[PDB]
Amino acid sequence: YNVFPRTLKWSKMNLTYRIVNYTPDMTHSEVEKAFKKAFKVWSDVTPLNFTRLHDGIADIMISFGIKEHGDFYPFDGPSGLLAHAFPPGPNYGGDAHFDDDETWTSSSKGYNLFLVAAHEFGHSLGLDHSKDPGALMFPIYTYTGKSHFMLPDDDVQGIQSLYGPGDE
Numbered sequence: 001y002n003v004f005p006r007t008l009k010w011s012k013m014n015l016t017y018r019i020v021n022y023t024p025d026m027t028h029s030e031v032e033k034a035f036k037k038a039f040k041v042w043s044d045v046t047p048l049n050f051t052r053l054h055d056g057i058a059d060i061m062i063s064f065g066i067k068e069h070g071d072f073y074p075f076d077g078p079s080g081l082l083a084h085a086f087p088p089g090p091n092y093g094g095d096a097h098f099d100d101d102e103t104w105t106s107s108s109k110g111y112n113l114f115l116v117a118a119h120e121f122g123h124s125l126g127l128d129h130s131k132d133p134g135a136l137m138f139p140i141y142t143y144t145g146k147s148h149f150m151l152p153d154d155d156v157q158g159i160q161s162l163y164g165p166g167d168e
């Protein structure tokens with residue numbers, strides 16, 4: 001029919017994700033904790049829930065790659081592009097890739113996977129870039145460290161504009 005359909009958000013509250021493969025730089029459990037905790041950033045302030053699948057099709061498919069890696073948005077080696085994620089949808093919708101030419105950590109050396117993933121998952125949920133330099137959806141990496149991390153209020157207001165508040 002006449003104009004193109006669109007999808008700025010997910011129709012459902014309960015999302016699945018799958019970790020298709022793993023960076024060399026962190027243990028499986030490290031990576032697992034990072035992604036679990038990146039998702040809890042968003043689920044904490046919305047009705048959204050996130051579950052892990054070990055195999056098959058999930059809403060959010062997460063993998064690690066270098067250079068041309070299967071979607072024609074190539075990566076660029078260390079620095080520059082760090083990761084990307086597709087907005088909500090069927091097929092590639094919500095899918096997150098991380099540049100394995102980067103050095104990813106659970107600390108302050110290299111790129112802290114959790115921070116960069118909590119940013120990619122906003123994209124995965126339909127958030128674009130913020131112009132608030134303090135905001136997590138601000139396209140500049142700033143390091144924070146797990147126990148000091150609070151979702152700033154611009155990413156709160158952003159995501160709750162799409163999905164409303166969570167419990168509380």
Ligand SMILES: CCOCCC1(Oc2ccc(Oc3ccc(F)cc3)cc2)C(=O)NC(=O)NC1=O
Pocket residue numbers: 080081082083084085115116117119120123135136137138139140141142143
């Ligand atoms: C539309 C794509 O623009 C390309 C730039 C890009 O790089 C980053 C990706 C995630 C980042 O994560 C953050 C963002 C804000 C923080 F405070 C801490 C970490 C920071 C940079 C990226 O590589 N991939 C992204 O999805 N967004 C980014 O901003």
Ligand SMILES: [Ca+2]
Pocket residue numbers: 075076077078079080081082099101102
């Ligand atoms: Ca890169």
Ligand SMILES: [Zn+2]
Pocket residue numbers: 069071073084097
């Ligand atoms: Zn990709």
Ligand SMILES: [Zn+2]
Pocket residue numbers: 119123129137139
């Ligand atoms: Zn971004």
